[PDB]
Design a protein around this ligand. Sequence first.
Ligand SMILES: [Mg+2]
Length: 127
Amino acid sequence: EEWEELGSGIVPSFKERRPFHERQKDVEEIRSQQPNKVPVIIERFDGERSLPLMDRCKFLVPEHITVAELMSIVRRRLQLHPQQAFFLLVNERSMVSNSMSMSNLYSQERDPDGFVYMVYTSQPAFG
Ligand SMILES: [Mg+2]
C-alpha cells in the first residue's frame, strides 16, 4: 500500500516548475548583471502537434533586437520547412513581424514575475 505517482511523462511549464518568488529572484539578479538584456520564456503551445520542442526555455535577448528578428531566430532554431506555419504569441495574442524593440516589448508585455512569456504555434489566430 504505497503511493504511486502518475503523470511523470507530462512536462510542466516554467511557471509550474518554479515558484513565483523564485522566478522573481531570477529576473532581479539577471537584470542587475546584464541590464541591456530581456528575460524571456519561450515554450510550445499546449495543443501543438506539428512544431517540435526545444531543449531550452529560458532566454536572454538584447534590448535592440526586433520582434521580426526574434521570430526568425526562433523559427531558424526549430529547423522547419519554410512553408510551415509559425506564429509567436505574448499573453495569448499573435505578433506581427514588426519593427519594435525587445525593450519596448518588455515594458508593454512583462509578467508580474519579471519575465516575458511567449508561446509558439502552428495554429493561426484567424482562419
Ligand atoms: Mg500542461
